[PDB]
């Protein structure tokens, strides 16, 4: 079978078909991915300036598609013509992503106030002081430039980005579990659904959710020295006892109980379904597959964090080159030459190289999420006798 797809849905359908097909009754998450992959790619990376420019170019292409229908595209241009709408949606999401990142045109910009974030007190004290900076006013539309974009703010910001990516991966896994439950409801198994999907889901979900809730509790408490590694320090002891840093008063005993529950659920993920089948009368693949999937989700979160850090580094390099060209040019000619060279280099790095790399990484992450989620391949497209030349 093949589902009906609009012009925007065409690219999502192409990506889903590349990731196999599914049964006619089997749910197709291609429509959901048509937003999720933009949702992850926006979280993955984004440049406000060139990304807006890329979106404008894609919109111009969509407007001129009437001629592009007549004008045959060349190689990757053909795929671009099909996926223009999806690319535009992804760029639209990346716009809000950059707004969160506050690096407008790959450069921090003040929001609302003259300076979005500043240093309260320490009028004479340097930024490298015990008092250092105090953000009396915090940027409401994005990360505070003092707390993120400044010289020494990079490590804590990167740690926070990685911590947030971990939660995003947990949410993606939960969405996949929800999709699996929906498919099971569509599958309509009287008790086999509870025996198979419920144990396979929820177990690793709560396993990672313990750490996610620990991160939330840390954000509430605001511990400083451990940075984002307080969770690592806590989880470093899978054994009982100790647990001094535990924010929740009962976090230690509850964590031990949760570990025991996960250990008990680990066979429950595998054993019940073959037992029910034998009573009526793969799991070996499902074996260790949960641990591998959790590792893959952690890998996706780490990849997103690394992509964001790399994009920030590239933006910083471009800004440094532009500043060097502008400052060291009393004459207009040197400044113009440097600006043109920097613009060309930054365009090539971001709109082509970084953009393609981020798109590929996001596609890989979405494919992993779908494979863990559902639709299990195993299908093909509906076959009508359409006139290929005419249609």
């Amino acid at each position: 079978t093949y589902f009906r797809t609009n012009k925007f849905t065409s690219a999502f359908q192409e990506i889903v078909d590349a990731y196999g097909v599914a049964k006619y009754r089997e749910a197709n998450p291609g429509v959901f991915t048509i937003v999720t992959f933009p949702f992850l790619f926006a979280v993955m990376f984004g440049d406000w300036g060139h990304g807006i420019c890329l979106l404008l170019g894609t919109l111009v292409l969509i407007v001129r598609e009437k001629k592009l229908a007549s004008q045959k595209l060349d190689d990757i241009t053909d795929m671009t013509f099909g996926g223009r709408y999806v690319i535009l949606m992804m760029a639209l999401f990346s716009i809000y992503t950059g707004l969160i990142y506050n690096e407008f045109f790959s450069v921090p910009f003040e929001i609302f106030s003259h300076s979005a974030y500043a240093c309260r007190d320490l009028s004479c004290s340097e930024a490298t002081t015990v008092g250092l900076i105090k953000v009396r006013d915090t940027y409401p539309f994005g990360v505070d430039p003092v707390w993120h974009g400044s010289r020494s703010e990079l490590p804590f910001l990167n740690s926070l980005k990685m911590k947030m990516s971990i939660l995003l991966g947990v949410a993606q896994m939960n969405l996949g579990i929800i999709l699996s439950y929906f498919n099971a409801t569509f599958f309509r198994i009287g008790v086999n659904i509870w025996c198979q999907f419920i144990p396979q889901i929820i177990f690793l979900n709560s396993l990672f959710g313990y750490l996610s809730l620990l991160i939330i509790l840390k954000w509430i408490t605001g511990s400083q020295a451990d940075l984002y590694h307080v969770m690592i320090y806590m989880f470093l002891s899978p054994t009982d006892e100790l647990g001094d840093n535990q924010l929740f008063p009962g976090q230690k005993t509850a964590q031990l109980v949760l570990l025991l529950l996960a250990f008990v659920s680990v066979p429950w993920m595998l054993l019940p379904k073959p037992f029910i089948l034998k009573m009526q009368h793969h799991q070996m693949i499902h074996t260790i597959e949960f641990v591998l999937g959790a590792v893959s989700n952690t890998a996706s979160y780490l990849r997103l964090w690394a992509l964001s850090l790399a994009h920030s580094e590239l933006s910083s390099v471009f800004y440094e080159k532009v500043l060097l060209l502008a400052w060291g040019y009393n004459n207009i000619l040197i400044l113009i030459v440097g600006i043109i060279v920097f613009i060309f280099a930054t365009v090539g790095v971001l709109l082509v190289m970084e953009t393609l790399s981020a798109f590929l990484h996001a596609l890989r992450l979405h494919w992993v999420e779908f494979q863990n989620k559902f639709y299990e391949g195993d299908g093909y497209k509906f076959s009508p006798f359409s006139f290929a030349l005419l249609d």
Binding site: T1, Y24, S383, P384, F385, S386, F387, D391
Partner: peptide, 27 residues
């Protein structure tokens, strides 16, 4: 939401039906 279906096309009428259904068709 598809299902199997069969249609018996008369031999003489087969050409016209094929020509009509050629554009998009169903199966």
């Amino acid at each position: 939401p598809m299902q199997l279906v069969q249609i018996i096309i008369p031999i003489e009428s087969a050409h016209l039906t094929v020509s009509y259904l050629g554009e998009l068709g169903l199966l």
